[PDB]
Amino acid sequence: RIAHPGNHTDRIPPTGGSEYNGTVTEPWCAPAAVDNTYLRLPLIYESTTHYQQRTGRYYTEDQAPPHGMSLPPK
């Protein structure tokens, strides 16, 4: 029902955890490089093990502290 809402009256309300920029606490900001405007930068640039280290102690990924795009996480 989320994938194909169609014309149904009983639509599923959004969860509020997914955002295009990847952060639920910070608004969109213009990137330093012009060609990176359309990319989802906070999601592309993160290793898998770092992701499971940061997100491991939370039942849900939006409760985790923001990535921060820093070599040691903020």
Partner: protein
Amino acid sequence: REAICIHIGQAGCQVGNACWELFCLEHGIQPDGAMPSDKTIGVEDDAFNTFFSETGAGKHVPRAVFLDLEPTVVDEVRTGTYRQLFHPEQLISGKEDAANNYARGHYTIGKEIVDLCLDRIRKLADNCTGLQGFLVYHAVGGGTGSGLGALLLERLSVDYGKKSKLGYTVYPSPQVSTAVVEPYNSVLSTHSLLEHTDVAAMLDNEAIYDLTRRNLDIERPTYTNLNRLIGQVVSSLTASLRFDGALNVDLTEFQTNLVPYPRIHFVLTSYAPVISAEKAYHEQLSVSEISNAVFEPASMMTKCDPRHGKYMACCLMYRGDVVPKDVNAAVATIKTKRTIQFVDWSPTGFKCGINYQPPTVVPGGDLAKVQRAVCMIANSTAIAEVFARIDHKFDLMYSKRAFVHWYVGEGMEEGEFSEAREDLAALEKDYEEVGAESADMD
């Protein structure tokens, strides 16, 4: 009381990340090494001591080394979230890999790195007062894991002597494969694992993938799921040291009960309540149900069928809310089955352990929360089929000397292939002979 963990190469370090996340979360140590200053439970219990030591500043730090020949994985550990937990000396990294050559690891490259490893192990063993073994995690399919793991186990075995060495080993899956040269490395590895380990637990990634598809509801698993399962198994085996219980089991009791003859030390491992949160509400999960679960071959973490062999000894570890009478009733029910067979020279087939601390639940985890669990390690003649497929693949490849020039260039005599293949053949014949009925008295 204490145990020291040695993590080698990529699989061993990645499994280490899952293990130490779990052990921190189970004891309650924060990722920065400091316990919550406002958490006054009332009695500061000693249970951490099996895995942590204090820095005198009151930080906890763990009894582990991380060993790699390439920098990337250890630098990833150095820059992650747990930066402050580890002592920086514990994270040892070389410059360049062993390039899938056992010969390069053993002769050329590991010989440079091995003395730093020995100095760290020396510094750990000096900060103990009842050390009772080493736990080692590595894969035998890759070059540095095989070559440096063997070299390091040899050096440990000369220096420490009688101290126990327990290995968790990632073996080549029977048809899933990741590299071409896996048979050579596994053959050359098995001589060292035969001589220089007290119990060896065998793992195949294909079995844990099947288990995560079948039991859990995960369509696209990745290594973090497997590593969390392995961490749960290790926590179950070491729980007997750390928490109150009815029947404790020290690692020497494990070694005494599980190993009948000094060469017959390769064991199968399985874990019962692998279950999703949605499945957990349709079923009760009593002692007898999970005891019945550990004996089904669908539960095993190694791709072998135990119905094709005979059990010699089983060690069953129960943790959580279990009562000994229920364990006895379950074991009595297992004994009746006809598709479970013990060698006639092993009448008293079971060892039990019972611990009160239930398994911990990890926030991002995929396992459900459950009141009780059981973990089994068992020794069985079925393992002989496992060796046979490597020997056939080695014979197929070695008949044309398909890659040998790499090994000879990196320092190995061609003769060493045939020696190792004959030694593994004799081990196969030992497992054939032990399972032969005693028809001598007729």
